[PDB]
Amino acid sequence: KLVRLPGLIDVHVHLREPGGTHKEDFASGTAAALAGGITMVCAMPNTRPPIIDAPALALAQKLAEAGARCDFALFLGASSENAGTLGTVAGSAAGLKLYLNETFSELRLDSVVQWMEHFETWPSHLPIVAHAEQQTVAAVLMVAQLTQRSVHISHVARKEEILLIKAAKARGLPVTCEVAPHHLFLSHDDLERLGPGKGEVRPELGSRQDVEALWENMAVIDCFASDHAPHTLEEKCGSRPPPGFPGLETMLPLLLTAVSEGRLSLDDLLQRLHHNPRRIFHLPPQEDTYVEVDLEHEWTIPSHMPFSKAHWTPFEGQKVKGTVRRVVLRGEVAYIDGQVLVPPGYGQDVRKWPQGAVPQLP
Amino acid sequence: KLVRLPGLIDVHVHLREPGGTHKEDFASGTAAALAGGITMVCAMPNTRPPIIDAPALALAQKLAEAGARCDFALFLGASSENAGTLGTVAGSAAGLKLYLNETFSELRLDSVVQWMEHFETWPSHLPIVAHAEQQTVAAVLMVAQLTQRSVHISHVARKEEILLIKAAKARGLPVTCEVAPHHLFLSHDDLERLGPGKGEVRPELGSRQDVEALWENMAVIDCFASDHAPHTLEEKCGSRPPPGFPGLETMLPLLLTAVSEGRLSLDDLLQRLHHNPRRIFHLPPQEDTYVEVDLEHEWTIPSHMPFSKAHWTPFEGQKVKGTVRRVVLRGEVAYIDGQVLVPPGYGQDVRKWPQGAVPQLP
Ligand SMILES: [Zn+2]
Ligand SMILES: [Zn+2]
Ligand SMILES: [Zn+2]
Ligand SMILES: [Zn+2]
């Protein structure tokens, strides 16, 4: 007996196109999404070139429309040069992303004053997301208060961070956050097995106490999102390992295992992979769209999942219970038992749908 | 014709006793203070042992009462172990100091949650000061708002920081700040001359644009304070140079030069070295206490000033106009033209004066 879920949404994926297509592209990344029960993704802007102006966004939109197999929205990225310049294209994007810790030259912000300028200039009704670790979470929360608006904090990984967000919410501040599966299901205890190269991710893997704190504070977590950050094994095992893990194909199976063990409910899961992503990012419903999962099937995560070009996974060897059996996207069968059945280009930009525009005052 | 000033206050000095007395002690540091026209100092807690509990404070109080030549108050320091333990001695201290960036093991805080615990437990009517650089200023401001109280930011050094504080003040937040003379009178342009060892200080020397921003934003600066941080030349020129500059003997001459050039007024100076320190830290007046200065005398800063055991200065070679001629402290001549005339032990703990206790609700 299969369980029918709505079409799940991952608001944080790196699909590497343009410019890193050996790591992943729209076609491979969205195949990975569908196999993981995800029917809509929001793609991050740290591509090459990065999506930091209108021409780069226009290119990315066409690459996505031609390559995506599931539906999508594309983030714009904040730079040291583009505050006050994105107003005409802002509404066509998923939102604006600020990289406040380690980043590529083009997305580096060298001053909190630049963060303020973005919060002041980006349209007030549109989403802003920050990669912010440790005290940077407190800092960007301050900037959000000074500019009187909301902020979404990406991949919370530490007890310190989730307790700070909890305290902010207790004071009624408009902050939401997400947590990635590797910060719920891996810790320092796994670095031995992974090694210093594969184990490289940002935010870094937490202690057992960090992991326990995130579970204890599940009520504070608004969304789950993969931070799918594909890099090849050659890159991860090399001399200058880039941070990041692939995660689209493993996220839902890991979380379904946790549901089966009673660590959270099916509803808790659907709030965090469907309802809260919709409401925070103003993402539209998808008609005739659903995912069928088998909660009984026990399997072991292999050395690589079938679709991501990353061709490795940090969850290798973990036992899971829960499998995606079928995905239907807008009335077409998109995935069955290991086979993707919609072509590159089937996916659409949800921000171009009438129901996908963010409502605003005239 | 000499100008009579009130007794000036430096709220940020490191006098190194106990535990670093080769660098400075209470007797030498307060001689330096008097020679710089300073009649009251607030001593920082990063001594050895650091002033992080009642026994250490008790020892420091006796060392100061025996050695100080001018009046003083002593800070307590926040640690990872002492939140909630300082209530009985808190009122006897200048305030509580948090070291939020680089620090010794004992004063290191590893989580913003620890900062919050201190803001929640330290008595609400007593001062809290933070060493906070760059985004750390935004972070500690957030903690101050979450806990609904004030904070004083030490040595603001950058355009980024002063503009952040300016924006916070425009929103009516209870934040004050101070700037040190090296961040007004030295910059990157001086690193050539100083070298990488002598030039080591935290916050680091700013760009010319940072320096210009602090002057342009003088209205935002509540206090001047030296951050007198004596280290010997051997230490500064050695393989692991500690950060910090000596500054008590040079601060007032540098600032008087700026007054003579019309860069700020005499009143602007007295607000920042007398009135605002009194009101922010609830420091009492000193009876029959005053400083006589000569604003006409031009001289060149030598390779070392007479009193600090640091026996070097980063201002060597700068031309100044303005000299301290006489200091009277509580009715006794304390300093005349290069000679200190009150003995170690003349100085008193102002927090023990009836007028030096901080008023509170019963
Ligand atoms: Zn990130
Ligand atoms: Zn990311
Ligand atoms: Zn400091
Ligand atoms: Zn200091």
- B164 interface with A at CB cutoff 8 Å: yes
Closest CA–CA distance from residue A74 to any residue of chain B (Å):
28
Q: CA B334: distance to chain centroid?
A: 21
- The CA distance from A289 to B285, in Å, is 75
Which of A138, A146, A164 lies closest to B168 in CB terms?
Answer: A146
Would the CB atoms of B135 and A135 count as touching at under 8 Å?
yes
| Structural tokens at position B6 | 């009130």
A168 closest CA partner among B43, B276, B112:
B112
Residue B136 has a CB neighbour count (10 Å cut-off) of 22
DSSP-assigned letter for residue A68: -
Residues 6+ apart with CB under 8 A from B114: B78, B80, B83
DSSP-assigned letter for residue A304: S
Task: For residue A298, count CB atoms less than 10 angstroms from its CB and return exposed for 0-12, middle for 13-18, buried for 19 or more.
Answer: exposed
Question: Do A126 and A96 meet the contact criterion of CB atoms below 8 Å apart?
Answer: yes
Amino acid identity at B216 = E
| Sheet containing strand A339-340, strands side by side | A3-6, A290-300, A319-329, A332-336, A339-340
Task: For residue A147, count CB atoms less than 10 angstroms from its CB and return exposed for 0-12, middle for 13-18, buried for 19 or more.
Answer: buried
Residues from chain A that touch B135, judged by Cβ atoms under 8 A, are 100, 112, 135-136, 139
User: B238 C-alpha to center of ligand 3: Å?
Assistant: 21
Residues 6+ apart with CB under 8 A from B140: A138, B98, B100, B115, B130, B132, B151, B153
Question: Do A257 and A263 meet the contact criterion of CB atoms below 8 Å apart?
Answer: no
User: A65 C-alpha to center of ligand 3: Å?
Assistant: 53
- The CA distance from A361 to A125, in Å, is 9
- The CA distance from B223 to B278, in Å, is 10
Place of tokens 């003995």: B343
Closest CA–CA distance from residue A111 to any residue of chain B (Å):
6
Closest CA–CA distance from residue A149 to any residue of chain B (Å):
14
- The CA distance from B204 to B191, in Å, is 10
Give the resolution to one decimal, in Å: 1.6
| Structural tokens at position B240 | 């692991």
Which of A146, A163, A167 lies closest to B171 in CB terms?
Answer: A146
Question: Do B272 and B221 meet the contact criterion of CB atoms below 8 Å apart?
Answer: yes
Which of B135, B159, B160 lies closest to A136 in CB terms?
Answer: B135
Place of tokens 């070679």: B317
- The CA distance from A335 to A337, in Å, is 7
| Structural tokens at position B215 | 């002057």
- B134 interface with A at CB cutoff 8 Å: yes
- Say which CATH number the domain at A292 has: 3.20.20.140
Q: Is A262 left (phi over 0), alpha (psi -120 to 50) or beta?
A: left
Q: How many residues does chain A have?
A: 362
Question: Do B283 and B218 meet the contact criterion of CB atoms below 8 Å apart?
Answer: no
Residues from chain B that touch A113, judged by Cβ atoms under 8 A, are 159-160, 163-164
Give the Cα-Cα-Cα angle A84, A89, A91 (nearest 5 degrees). 105
Q: Is B115 left (phi over 0), alpha (psi -120 to 50) or beta?
A: alpha
SS3 assignment for chain B: CCEEEECEEEEEECCCCCCCCCCCCHHHHHHHHHHCCEEEEEECCCCCCCCCCHHHHHHHHHHHHHHCCCEEEECEECCCCCCCCCCCCHHHCCCEEEECCCCCHHHCCCCHHHHHHHHHHCCCCCCEEEECCCHHHHHHHHHHHHCCCCEEECCCCCHHHHHHHHHHHHCCCCEEEEECCHHHHCCHHHHHHHHHHHCCCCCCCCCHHHHHHHHHCHHHCCEECCCECCCCHHHHCCCCCCCCECCHHHHHHHHHHHHHCCCCCHHHHHHHHHHHHHHHHCCCCCCCCEEEEEEEEEEECCCCCCCCCCCCCCCCCCEEEEEEEEEEECCEEEEECCEECCCCCCCCEHHHCHHHCCCCCC
Burial A300-331 (b: 16+ CB within 10 A, else e): ebeebbebbbbbbbbbbebebbbbbbbbbbbe
Size of interface A-B (CB pairs under 8 A): 61
Would the CB atoms of B171 and A140 count as touching at under 8 Å?
no
| Sheet containing strand A38-43, strands side by side | A8-13, A38-43, A71-74
Candidates B133, B146, B166, partner chain A, best to mutate (most A CBs within 10 A)? B146
Residues from chain B that touch A136, judged by Cβ atoms under 8 A, are 135, 139
- The CA distance from A362 to A264, in Å, is 42
Q: Extract the runs of DSSP E, i.e. beta strands, from chain A.
A: 3-6, 8-13, 38-43, 71-74, 76-77, 96-99, 128-131, 151-153, 175-179, 223-224, 290-300, 319-329, 332-336, 339-340
Which of B139, B145, B164 lies closest to A135 in CB terms?
Answer: B139
Closest CA–CA distance from residue B136 to any residue of chain A (Å):
7
Q: CA B34: distance to chain centroid?
A: 14
Residue A346 has a CB neighbour count (10 Å cut-off) of 19
Helix, strand or coil for residue A231?
A: coil
- The CA distance from B157 to B213, in Å, is 9
- A207 interface with B at CB cutoff 8 Å: no
- A102 interface with B at CB cutoff 8 Å: no
The number of domains in chain B is: 1
Burial B52-63 (b: 16+ CB within 10 A, else e): bbeebbeebbeb
DSSP string, A128-190: EEEE--THHHHHHHHHHHHTT--EEE----SHHHHHHHHHHHHTT--EEEEE-THHHH--GGG
Residues from chain B that touch A146, judged by Cβ atoms under 8 A, are 167-168, 171
Residues from chain A that touch B136, judged by Cβ atoms under 8 A, are 135, 139
Domain boundaries, position A275: 1-362
DSSP-assigned letter for residue A279: H
- The CA distance from A91 to A89, in Å, is 6
